[PDB]
DNA sequence: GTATAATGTG
């Protein structure tokens, strides 16, 4: 949202569409980082059920 | 500007310490300590112990103000290639690069000649660079890359 | 503290200048430089002219100082934009100051344009070149840095257009740079990992602690190599001593300098064609008897 | 200057040089000038003039 | 050989640094990007270290 | 090497 608000403050207002206004990179990056390095996302130990 | 000479920066402290005489100050502070004034006596005693430590040494206090920093051998700060061509190096290289760049830029500014404001800013940056090299967090905001 | 704060307090000590002020400053600088050139160019040195030129030089120094100090703040304004990359803010500010110093020695008042017009170009050039030169541990050519930045911008534009991170094939198609060079550039655009970073939470021992020397194997050079050398000094010596010297000079066991067939023949007085048969005899001998028993390993 | 001295507690530079920590930190980072020396002998001999 | 009676620590001076160093580092380059060799007068130069 | 014009962080 920070990136989006900066972009809409700078980008032209005539031919603007939300498709060119959203930036999906940070959210996917955050999700992947959480699932990869977060200390609460651990390998499921599978010695037995 | 014909009698008194003064300047700002670490060079000024170098000059001041060079002009300062340790033995004479030690004798005067011993004279002061010989009196009472307990409130000021503790501070006088701490200063006296430091000054006497310098006095008995036979060396000079100028060693505190550096004019040439050393660099450890590269094996102590190795730069190795990990599998996949992903280089790995110690932050000592980054700190030394900062110091070298600041020093070279300072030399370039002095050679070219510029108003004293920019030169003073460059000298301050170099001082901060050396400070960050010798210790991080010992003064001010620590540097962080990642 | 806050060295940025003290510099920004100092920079504002002087106010900006209007068009007429900058024009007159440029005129003063022109007069100063003209006097500087004349002072050493003149074959006959005038006496009062000497004093006049000295005063003019002082005034010209003051004029350059005033112009640079007045226009400094543009340096901060332009440098604030490039932050977030490798170099800090003050480094970029100093780079821009150097660029401004470079620019000021070319400004002209006849054109009539404002100084910032001719200053922003050089400030941006200096800042970008300095960032490309002294912002990465492994320095890269300026053209290669430009290509890496081009690849990054192309990727970001493709992501913006398609809403998803561009594929490698589509990156090659859009940029036209083959996948090989794209992979090379991607490999050249990664900050080296710091060895002091804790690894595996294994007592937070740094990565540097787990890197093998990768060379100088103890046992290999300790026993195997030296014992091979000694057994060779025994075996090759057990051959004809003349042939032992021939081998020493042929490969360079003692003094390097592997003697070619013709050279060794000249040294021994023999012909270039004999050395092939000599080597054939040596290799035949080395492959039989206790020599093979000793030297079957090491291959 | 070596960081270990003008920043340590006690700051050996401050104790030896009888300068308060605030003044020392200001002087080191090019904040305020300092009068290193003065021709006191000439000033005294020329006190009348 | 191994006759170490005492081990003292002193405050190094500029001349000590000068005379206990075998070269001067005059450029910031560490290693060449393509040939993987130390660069002249760099932090890894063979001439120095 | 550049000339609309820009003139103090985060």
UniProtKB/Swiss-Prot annotation, chain A:
Effect of residue 40 to P: In strain: vr2; rifampicin-resistant
Membrane-spanning segments: none
Domain of life: Bacteria
Role played: DNA-dependent RNA polymerase catalyzes the transcription of DNA into RNA using the four ribonucleoside triphosphates as substrates.
Subunit record text: The RNAP catalytic core consists of 2 alpha, 1 beta, 1 beta' and 1 omega subunit. When a sigma factor is associated with the core the holoenzyme is formed, which can initiate transcription. Interacts with CarD, TRCF (Mfd) and RbpA.
Similarity field: Belongs to the RNA polymerase beta chain family.
Protein name, entry field: DNA-directed RNA polymerase subunit beta
Annotated gene: rpoB
Residues of the full protein shown: 397 to 445 of 1178
UniProtKB/Swiss-Prot annotation, chain C:
Tagged with keyword Acetylation: no
Region annotated Sigma-70 factor domain-3, chain positions: 146-222
Sufficient to interact with RbpA: region residues: 1-205
DNA-binding region positions on the chain: 261-280
Ranges in coiled-coil conformation: none
CDD domains membership: Sigma70_r4 (cd06171)
Protein name, as recorded: RNA polymerase sigma factor SigB
The organism of origin for this protein: Mycobacterium tuberculosis (strain ATCC 25618 / H37Rv)
Curated annotation (Swiss-Prot), chain E:
Record-annotated disulphide pairs: none
Induction: 6-fold repressed by starvation.
Top-level taxon in the UniProt lineage: Bacteria
Role this protein plays: DNA-dependent RNA polymerase catalyzes the transcription of DNA into RNA using the four ribonucleoside triphosphates as substrates.
Subunit structure: The RNAP catalytic core consists of 2 alpha, 1 beta, 1 beta' and 1 omega subunit. When a sigma factor is associated with the core the holoenzyme is formed, which can initiate transcription.
Family named by the database record: Belongs to the RNA polymerase beta' chain family.
Protein name as annotated: DNA-directed RNA polymerase subunit beta'
Species whose genome carries this gene: Mycobacterium tuberculosis (strain ATCC 25618 / H37Rv)
Species classification: Bacteria, Bacillati, Actinomycetota, Actinomycetes, Mycobacteriales
